[PDB]
Amino acid sequence: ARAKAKTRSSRAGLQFPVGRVHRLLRKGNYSERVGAGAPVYLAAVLEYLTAEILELAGNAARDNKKTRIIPRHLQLAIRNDEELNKLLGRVTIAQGGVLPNIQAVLLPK
Amino acid sequence: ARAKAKTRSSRAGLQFPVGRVHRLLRKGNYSERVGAGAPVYLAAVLEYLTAEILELAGNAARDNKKTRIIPRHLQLAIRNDEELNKLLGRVTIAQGGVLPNIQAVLLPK
Amino acid sequence: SGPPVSELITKAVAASKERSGVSLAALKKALAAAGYDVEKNNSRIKLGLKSLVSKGTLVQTKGTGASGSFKLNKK
Amino acid sequence: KRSRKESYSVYVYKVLKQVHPDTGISSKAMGIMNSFVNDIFERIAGEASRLAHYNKRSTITSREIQTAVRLLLPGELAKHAVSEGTKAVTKYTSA
Amino acid sequence: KRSRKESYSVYVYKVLKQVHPDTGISSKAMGIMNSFVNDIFERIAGEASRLAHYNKRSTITSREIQTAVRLLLPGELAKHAVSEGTKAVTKYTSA
Amino acid sequence: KPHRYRPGTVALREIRRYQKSTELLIRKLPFQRLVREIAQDFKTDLRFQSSAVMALQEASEAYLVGLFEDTNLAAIHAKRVTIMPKDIQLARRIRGE
Amino acid sequence: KPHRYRPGTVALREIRRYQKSTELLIRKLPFQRLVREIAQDFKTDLRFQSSAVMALQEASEAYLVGLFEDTNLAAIHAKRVTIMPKDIQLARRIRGE
Amino acid sequence: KVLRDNIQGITKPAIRRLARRGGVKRISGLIYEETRGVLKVFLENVIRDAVTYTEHAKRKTVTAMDVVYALKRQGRTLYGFGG
Amino acid sequence: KVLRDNIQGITKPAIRRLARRGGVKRISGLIYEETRGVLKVFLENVIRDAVTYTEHAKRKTVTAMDVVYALKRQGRTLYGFGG
DNA sequence: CACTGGCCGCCTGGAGAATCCCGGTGCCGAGGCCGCTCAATTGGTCGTAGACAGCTCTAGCACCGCTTAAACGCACGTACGCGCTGTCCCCCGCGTTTTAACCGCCAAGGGGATTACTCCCTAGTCTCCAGGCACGTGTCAGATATATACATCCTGTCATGTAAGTA
DNA sequence: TACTTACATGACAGGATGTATATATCTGACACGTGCCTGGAGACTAGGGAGTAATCCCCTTGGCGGTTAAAACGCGGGGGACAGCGCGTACGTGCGTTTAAGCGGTGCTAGAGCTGTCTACGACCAATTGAGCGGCCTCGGCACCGGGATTCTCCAGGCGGCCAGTG
């Protein structure tokens, strides 16, 4: 007489896996106990981050008139947002290249 | 009736507390299991590291005609050992100051 | 129009006549104070000073080329 | 047949579809996205563990995650993530 | 009546007297040694934790910390450390 | 005529003194007042352990001495002995701020 | 008369070319050989995934482009446009090596 | 109780002394106010971290140990304060 | 079998291309050898850690997994190979 | 003395080439469907981590009175950034020749890596005890002060080399 | 044309002052004794992670032929590095002054911290399923090829300004 199996991601109205992130926290050994709201909150944080970065990547690709996200688009999306740049200054995206940035002394008169 | 008390640090011939290191590893959430020789090894490396840094501190104190270690001696010991300085590059010692270090172009003539 | 550049350079060097030769920067400031477009005539004044030092009316004191110090002839 | 290797494929793809109904993603950029989410998850988990240690608390709570996110993410990213997590935890507590 | 506050005074003092019979210590430098051993403990323990976790190993062994000390300490610090650690675990095995 | 050293020699003696000495270089009370002002922006009615102000003081002097030694490296890189602001922005921008 | 661009113009044009482009800039197989050469210095008979050579490569252009951008900043700091050994040493000194 | 212009409390000779510890011979006069700005940025970051630690503990008295934690999170490790 | 000198395989045009990606306009002649030395030093710093990881795993095969893990430890974290 | 050609700098249009942009085409990764299985879910339980109230005590804060150390400021000086120019050479661009990188194609085998097994090792629990420690005390290494000795820095002075007037 | 004289320069002695150096002194911070209790150790058990044996197959290594893009080399040359030299300023340094930090003392209390209660809350665990991953197939987005237009670049050519030679 069990109830229907509903999902905690749908309970939070989210698509990031609440159960799987909770599993990764429990087996990732950060404490012996993990509160119930913590993986939900974390999944919301991750989903917001991924949503806005894919948003920036989508506008970059649409600006690049490509309908598919390529790592160059991700690199442009990271480095054109200063807060994500400060978040991710220490990382390298594979095959991302760099921003087109020219020092003014390099350009001719 | 029962065996007489014998410390694990004396079993390893060490001064650093093997039992306390084992306890802190268990409560430090690094793994749920810790091997028996693992805190012995960690106490050994900690005891060795303290040995050279305190030796260099004592040598610097002897150079300063000082009987007791001052934090200036510790700063001088770390920054004059490039192996330790590579270990503790991003490190500040409180009230340690810096090396006497003047660039060559700063000097007169 | 007015006079050409050689006369004004001679006036600039003869206005002061220091023990050391006059520097090019002070000479530019002097001719600007008298009133002259030094901006589009840097090449003009440099070729003029080479012309006058080469023709012997004025002698180089210390420097080389347009740099350094300029002082008058013995007579 | 080979054993299952976990990925963040379907979740990030569904989020991309919600934020952009039309566009697609390359597979290698998709692996980059997987690495991104894994790295950020690791960072927040590490901060949560450290604050749990510092306050001698045995339990990772939503408060601890909120404090860790405020620690790590800068500015409007921090308060927007706080708002999103707050809305999510209010929805989940309301079942 | 007080609550318990732990530190590493006696061990640093004994190893100092072992390396220098006549050399003293100041209390501030003594706290610096306390914090030093604490910090090196967290570094080695955490990297031992990653070496354990990432290879699907649930246990810290002496081999785990041997890999970790090989990682963090540059050059002959690593070799001397692994030498005396090997000698110490050998003595603990023999006793 | 009263005695007077040439410039830099007094500065070099300051270099040797302050690299020899370990005590604080900024005054304690205005730094504590400044820390209270900065923390007033985030939370009202904060109190500070004296050791907390001391640790923040150590952080401040350590970060600034590191900043000026890298600034000195930048200045002598540009064949100068006088540091200027572009040295500090260069050092911070290379370091990652 | 045969045609010839002035110096730097080709340089700036392929600045734009390689900053627009994303692909690898080191030749693949000599880099793979160099990686194995370093590998046999630590342990004999090493074998490499192709992706391992790829990842060492991506990290190598990552570190080299970052270092070279920072040395470019050091060089324009010194009122020059050509990077020098002192630029490399300066950037590694502030960066921390 | 209200604090209004406290950045000037880090006086000019204090910055001169800090530059002397760093090995700086000659300092421009334009330097001091931007070092006040940079120092302000450093403290506002680290005190933002430490204050966040403080309100996390449901305390409103700042402790030194949290400042050690904040410098740890900035990767600017400090010994000598009970770390 | 053995390899004795392959550092010249990182050719002078390859250093030129890397400088071009970084925005470098003009490159001195002495640059190339010390950039080979720098890329050298970075490589043994990475690969020493990588083979330490590999021998800890008791494997004789380097993975990109261990390579990006060595980059993770060394502080130049890489996206695009994890997992 | 005035005219006029000649040299230099500046402005401008045109030719060529890299690139942008427009098409077609064929291809292979992306996306979507299906099968599968294993990990999230439900529900309950149990033990306990932390919230909550309360009580203590200590240290952070507020105030104040002297007390000089330091900060402010100004003035004089000098040395340092720096702007300009001139020179030299060194690296960019381009053409030619070479060469090995790459592709792509095929063989082999060795090691990841998976499953199974069986076993040593480690967490757990109870008991016991001694080592680390808060706390107290005393006491000498070092701070502090005073008095000397020398290092060092800046300057005045003397011998020398060189430019200049002149017999 | 060579001789004699004035100015710039460099070497050296010497004084002022800062800094080492010897010694008295007191002091409080370091060093050591003591009650103790709490965390470390002994012993034994459950059980399980993990070492190890066997296999496989997949991925890595090895090697061979062809092409050509890329590397190497040489020439040329122009542009950047940089040395030097003057200038003007802008900090350094040293004097005096203000004041505000700093030290010492006092009082308050607010919050840190520590103790007891309990109760919500999260881990454990058997049964269950459906959500997410492995595998397969297709096609259309996109890489590649090809052709026209555009922009950029570099240089040839035209115009003005000044200057110098000559009738």
Residue numbers in the entry:
A (entry chain m), B (entry chain q): 10 to 118
C (entry chain s): 35 to 109
D (entry chain n), E (entry chain r): 30 to 124
F (entry chain k), G (entry chain o): 37 to 133
H (entry chain l), I (entry chain p): 20 to 102
Paste lines from the article.
Here, we report cryo-EM structures of human H1-containing tetranucleosome arrays with four physiologically relevant NRLs. The structures show a zig-zag arrangement of nucleosomes, with nucleosomes 1 and 3 forming a stack. H1 binding to stacked nucleosomes depends on the NRL, whereas H1 always binds to the non-stacked nucleosomes 2 and 4. H1 contacts DNA with L1, the amino-terminal part of α2 together with L3, and α3 to stabilize the nucleosome and contribute to chromatin compaction.
Nucleosome 4 is not stacked with nucleosome 2 and is increasingly mobile as the NRL increases. We were nevertheless able to refine the structure of nucleosome 4 as part of a tetranucleosome in the 4×177 array and also in isolation within the 4×187 array. The H1 histone is present on nucleosome 2 in all four structures, and is also observed on nucleosome 4 in all cases where this nucleosome is structurally resolved. H1 that is bound to nucleosome 1 always contacts entering linker DNA via its helix α3, whereas H1 on nucleosome 3 uses α3 to contact exiting linker DNA. In nucleosomes 2 and 4, the entering linker DNA is in contact with α3. We found low Δβ values at nucleosome 2 and Δβ values of less than 6° at nucleosome 4, where H1 was always observed.
